[PDB]
Design a protein around this ligand. Structure first.
Ligand SMILES: Nc1ncnc2c1ncn2[C@@H]1OC[C@H](OP(=O)(O)OP(=O)(O)OP(=O)(O)O)[C@H]1O
Ligand SMILES: [Mg+2]
Length: 747
DNA sequence: GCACGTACGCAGTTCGCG
DNA sequence: CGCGAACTGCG
């Protein structure tokens, strides 16, 4: 397969490198025939003579137009006459792109901000991660000595553990008599020994957890400080820390650094994203953690280092086990977008969609729209459109509830009505599809750009969901659930891409249509099931709704539901279909987006309640869960009152564990761009002054202390919470946590 | 040479001023 | 001393 692609400079000309593992042997191919290029639109062909004269300087070397060739392409389906401008080195584009654009004759330039290595993959039709070639993996993690005030990566590395399919081992420079701990005295020698291990085993993939920000970055700093040649790559090169905005990423030429952190953050939604929490969510088994306070104590006292080695070994052990199950999922993702696994595992869903559209646009000789300037980006972010339909739920308890839901509503709407930028208000067509309310017209004579690509993703989701029923192993069922969720988010992102301010194929009118279509279908289906079939819709949210026949029994409501499904699906066009997504005995609808139902097997499923929100303490989630259990199962309202009263008694008496009193919250911005400072923002700003880097996406876990005033002023991180010194604000967790989450069931 | 991180709608908490 | 803005996370 094709692992990755980059380019070096030989005699001032770029040389594309293709890292590939063909027939079980590493190989690097060299292509020196690819030339940088980008298009330009001119008012008159006679101005091409005054365009080749435009020059620019790039550190002494003057940048000139190598060659020029007029090509005929298409822009959103209509033909266009553009001039292709060739260049010597890729870096010549960023130096002359702005000079060529501002020419009074040049209308606009196109495809000027495309990386060379990634332009080679699209133009040459090369697709990475394809081919029956198994990849050798090797996970590794490091243990560090951190002190309050010490700059990051300034302390020594205590242990360097690694794990592959052949077991897990730990390397340290302090005598530990454990069968898996190999002891060698120098930290440098530890690094150098780790260098021999990787070079000897020669893994194709290097799996880490947050290694781009800690494990591999810490190792790279010891490289430049201790003066070591960490030739870890297959070309004799050393790891390179690359910048991606605020975060950084480590690259190892010839190999693939698979950082599982960005992968898990896009696949699983957990309150906290620690390695011990991800292991519990995937494999369903607990993982013990050794904090830095105990690692620093074991290093100084010398006692207990065996347990520290057990933590480092387990760190690499679970990292390989998690990587062995999540790498194939990302390989499939890389095969769809057609980009290296390195870039795909660290890219957002919006970027993945754009990189796939850029490849398909080249396959169809379609000149790609260019990203918006800062002005248009701000203009797109300020504008919006009406979302989905939401109906105020009927209050009270209801019995014999059915949940009818549309099958991929928004994606199906795009394919059925050919909602795409190239088809929006296209003139000269024979058949059109008008969007409700919004009125946007879409050509249906030819398949749209986006609709022609969304069909396959929908089929894949129904295939994965089909194996979920045919799977008996719980581990394979959850892994398949992750795959179908990944396909749902990716497909739905195609819709969200229309509203993405940074999207090349930005189309608000396309996004307005998908919602207008969905709002019309759900509102008409609700009216049809009520007027014709006599159903009573209780709750409705976009693609689905909760309905029932008030006085009918369970057997009647279920049959009439399947009857209405065949009646409405026959009247629905194309891929538009409504599904029977489960029956429920009794249900409770608190408010909008928040409800709770119970099925035949007495399994209570909730939606939008505080039980699944990470910003609510577990003592509140546990109390709310037992209240729903006392109401939906037993139906004893007085029993729930005694439950919340028993919880408050334990809280006031300080009898609840501190682990059950943690509140997780995410830092979605930079600590400098926060208009208001909340509890989690105040704790983050305090950790930023202590050396901890609180970057966007960090989950803040704090505990409210017993005090008077602002909650943020009495908020302390969970790590520094000692029950001997600190005492939590029992009155806060009673009045502002346990009571409110359960008070909304007042009936 | 880039990634500037898919969309809207909404319940609900924290804070701050009156 | 209720309310509005800022903020998060859910569906
Ligand atoms: N993250 C998202 N971003 C944008 N649109 C989304 C997102 N999630 C869902 N949508 C839209 O929301 C509605 C619709 O979801 P399907 O019908 O595609 O998938 P089920 O079969 O799972 O439906 P159920 O939630 O179980 O009723 C999708 O277009
Ligand atoms: Mg749906």
């Amino acid at each position: 397969m094709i692992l990755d692609t980059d380019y070096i400079t030989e005699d001032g000309k770029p040389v594309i490198r293709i890292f590939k593992k063909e027939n079980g042997e590493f190989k690097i191919e060299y292509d020196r025939t690819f030339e940088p290029y980008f298009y330009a639109l001119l008012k008159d062909d006679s101005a091409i003579e005054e365009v080749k004269k435009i020059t620019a300087e790039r550190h002494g070397t003057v940048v000139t137009v190598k060659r020029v060739e007029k090509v005929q392409k298409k822009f959103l389906g209509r033909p266009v006459e553009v001039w292709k401008l060739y260049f010597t080195h890729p870096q010549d584009v960023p130096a002359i792109r702005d000079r060529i654009r501002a020419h009074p004759a040049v209308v606009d330039i196109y495809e000027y901000d495309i990386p060379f290595a990634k332009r080679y993959l699209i133009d040459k039709g090369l697709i990475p991660m394809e081919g029956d070639e198994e990849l050798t993996m090797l996970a590794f993690a490091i243990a560090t000595l951190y002190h309050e005030g010490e700059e990051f990566a300034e302390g020594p590395i205590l242990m360097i553990s690694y794990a592959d399919e052949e077991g897990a081992r730990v390397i340290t420079w302090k005598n530990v008599d454990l069968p898996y701990v190999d002891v060698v005295s120098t930290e440098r020698e530890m690094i150098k020994r780790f260098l021999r291990v990787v070079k000897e085993k020669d893994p194709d993939v290097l799996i880490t957890y947050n290694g781009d920000n800690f494990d591999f970055a810490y190792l790279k700093k010891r490289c430049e400080k201790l003066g070591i040649n960490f030739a870890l790559g297959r070309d004799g090169s050393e790891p390179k820390i690359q910048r991606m905005g605020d975060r950084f990423a480590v690259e190892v030429k010839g190999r693939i650094h698979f950082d599982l952190y960005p992968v898990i953050r896009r696949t699983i939604n957990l309150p906290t994203y620690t390695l011990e929490a991800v292991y519990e969510a995937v494999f369903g088994k607990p993982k013990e953690k050794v904090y830095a306070e105990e690692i620093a104590q074991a290093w100084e006292t010398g006692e207990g280092l065996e347990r520290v080695a057990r933590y480092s070994m387990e760190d690499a052990k679970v990292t390989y086990e998690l990587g062995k199950e999540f790498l194939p999922m990302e390989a499939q993702l890389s095969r769809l977008v057609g980009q290296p696994l390195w870039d795909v595992s660290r890219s957002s869903t919006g970027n993945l969609v754009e990189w796939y559209l850029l490849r398909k646009a080249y396959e169809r000789n379609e000149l790609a729209p260019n990203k918006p300037d800062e002005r248009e980006y701000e203009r797109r972010l300020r504008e919006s459109y009406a979302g989905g339909y939401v109906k105020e739920p009927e209050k009270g308890l209801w019995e014999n509830i059915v949940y009818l839901d549309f099958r991929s509503l928004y994606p199906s709407i795009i394919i059925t009505h050919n909602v795409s930028p190239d088809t929006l208000n296209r003139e000269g067509c024979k058949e059109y599809d008008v969007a409700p309310q919004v009125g946007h017209r879409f050509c249906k004579d030819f398949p749209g750009f986006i609709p022609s690509l969304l069909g396959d993703l929908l089929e894949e989701r129904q295939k994965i969901k089909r194996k979920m029923k045919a799977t008996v192993d719980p581990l394979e069922k959850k892994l398949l659930d992750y795959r179908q969720r990944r396909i749902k988010i990716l497909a739905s992102s195609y819709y969200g891409y229309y509203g993405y301010a940074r999207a090349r194929w930005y189309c608000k009118e396309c996004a307005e249509s998908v919602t207008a279509w969905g709002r019309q279908y759900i509102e008409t289906t609700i009216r049809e099931i009520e007027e014709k079939f006599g159903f009573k819709v209780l709750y409705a949210d976009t693609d689905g709704f909760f309905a029932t026949i008030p006085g009918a029994d369970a057997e009647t409501v279920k049959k009439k539901a399947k009857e209405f499904l065949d009646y409405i699906n026959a009247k629905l066009p194309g891929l538009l279909e409504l599904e029977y997504e489960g029956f429920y005995k009794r249900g409770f609808f608190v408010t909008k987006k928040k409800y709770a139902v119970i099925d035949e097997e007495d399994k209570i499923t909730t939606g939008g309640l505080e039980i699944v929100r990470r910003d609510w303490s577990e003592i509140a989630k546990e109390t709310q869960a037992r209240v729903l259990e006392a109401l939906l199962k037993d139906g004893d309202v007085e029993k729930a009152v005694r439950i919340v009263k028993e919880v408050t008694e334990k809280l006031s008496k300080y009898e609840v564990p501190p682990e059950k009193l943690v509140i997780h919250e995410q830092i979605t911005r930079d600590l400098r761009d926060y208009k208001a400072t909340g509890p989690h923002v105040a704790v983050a700003k305090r950790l930023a002054a202590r050396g901890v880097k609180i970057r966007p996406g960090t989950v803040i876990s704090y505990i409210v202390l017993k005090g008077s005033g602002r909650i943020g002023d009495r908020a302390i991180p969970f790590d520094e919470f000692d029950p001997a010194k600190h005492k939590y604000d029992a009155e806060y967790y009673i009045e502002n946590q346990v009571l409110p989450a359960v008070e909304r069931i007042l009936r």
